[PDB]
Amino acid sequence: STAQGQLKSIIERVERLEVEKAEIMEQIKEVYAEAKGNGFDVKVLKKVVRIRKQDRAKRQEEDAILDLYLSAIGEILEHHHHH
Amino acid sequence: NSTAQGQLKSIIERVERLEVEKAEIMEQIKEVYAEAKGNGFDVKVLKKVVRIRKQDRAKRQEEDAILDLYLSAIGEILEH
Amino acid sequence: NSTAQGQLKSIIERVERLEVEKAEIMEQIKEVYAEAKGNGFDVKVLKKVVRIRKQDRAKRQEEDAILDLYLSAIGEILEHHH
Amino acid sequence: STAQGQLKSIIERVERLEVEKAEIMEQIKEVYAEAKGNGFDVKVLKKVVRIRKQDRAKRQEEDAILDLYLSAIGEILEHHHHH
DNA sequence: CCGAAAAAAAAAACG
DNA sequence: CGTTTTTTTTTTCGG
């Protein structure tokens, strides 16, 4: 039936995507293992990745607000030029 | 603290790319579930179905692992 | 602040006693495994057996939970035709 | 055989102990939940409990070193009670 | 936001 | 010692 087929496609797509996600997580562990093999401190590395992630989030908030300012300026410009 | 730092950069950049890909996957999963809800499905029940199937596969590999432990223990006893 | 201080110490003290008890339990578990090891058992295999049995109990609990979801969803569909 | 019975008592004792352990973890979680219900921040509470645990480890190590000093002094005292 | 469920990070046991 | 699981903290995600 159509509902059985929809169910099957849902479970199938989710399970494939989660396979891919597990592959990504495993590759990340590969990078950390190689970093450790070259003498790096994995724990501080993970802390660095977390900190850079947090700073990146702040920058994106700043960029969205920045775009608000740019939008208001854009309206002021179009109004200035015509009339 | 010189020529290791160039490698450090490759490390962090590779990690950041991989986590980008990971977030893209998570987003696709969320999209599939939201479309399922839009087609009248209960996302919570769907996730429980996926969860149980995942646990069953994990158990099956676990039992393969205990089997391998048994065969190894026997071989260790018989070799020495 | 002030009045909360009496509650704070009672909380931390009860939790810390409970953590004492939990650590004592972990010690007893290690004792059982060590004595079995002294009797020739393979501790790793034993832990795997305990772990598999626990996974079976978890799986059965999950099956009961999804069963309840099915029953509730059926009740939802039927009770909201009227 | 006797090894079958030993196996069974082992598995049952461990499983009984892990039952007890899960009940204790539940009591801890409940205490934190009611504390939160009284307006506390659970995360900071857990951080404090962890810090006190770390202090307890530090003091017990230092107390063991203290015992080394006390024992050596005791040896000097037994030597003294001879002169 | 909450409460459960996944994942990351931290801690510890085993050889 | 270190590694390779276990335990805890942090994060996710639907409601």
Author numbering:
A (entry chain B), D (entry chain D): 14 to 96
B (entry chain A): 13 to 92
C (entry chain C): 13 to 94
Question: What does the report in the manuscript say about this coordinate set?
Answer:
Depletion of GapR gene in Caulobacter cells results in severe defects in cell growth, cell division, cell size, DNA replication, chromosome segregation/condensation and gene expression. Taken all together, there exist both major conformation and minor conformation for free GapR in solution, which are in dynamic exchange equilibrium with each other.
We report the crystal structure of a 10-bp A-tract DNA bound by GapR in an open tetrameric conformation, which is representative of the minor conformers of free GapR. The open tetramer of GapR can be considered as a dimer of two antiparallel coiled-coil dimer-units formed mainly through α1 helices. The two dimer-units form a tetramer through further dimerization with one α2 helix from each dimer-unit in an antiparallel coiled-coil conformation, while the other two α2 helices are free of contact. The tetrameric interface is formed by hydrophobic residues V57, V61, I64, I78, L81 and Y82, with 6 intermolecular salt bridges between residues K60 and E74, R63 and E74, D68 and K71. The 10A DNA is partially wrapped inside the open tetramer of GapR, which adopts a C-clamp like shape. The binding of 10A DNA is mainly through electrostatic interactions between the phosphate groups of a 15-bp DNA portion and side-chains of positively charged residues of GapR, consisting of K34, K49, K59 and R63 of all four protomers, K42 and K60 from three of the protomers, and K56 and K66 from two of the protomers, according to interface analysis using PISA. There are no base-specific contacts between GapR and 10A DNA. Therefore, the major difference between the two tetramer structures lies that one tetrameric interface of the closed conformation is fully dissociated in the open tetrameric conformation, while the other one is rearranged to form a new antiparallel coiled-coil interface. Therefore, the crystal structure of the open tetrameric GapR should be considered as representative of an ensemble of dynamic minor conformations, which should be in fast exchange on the NMR time scale.
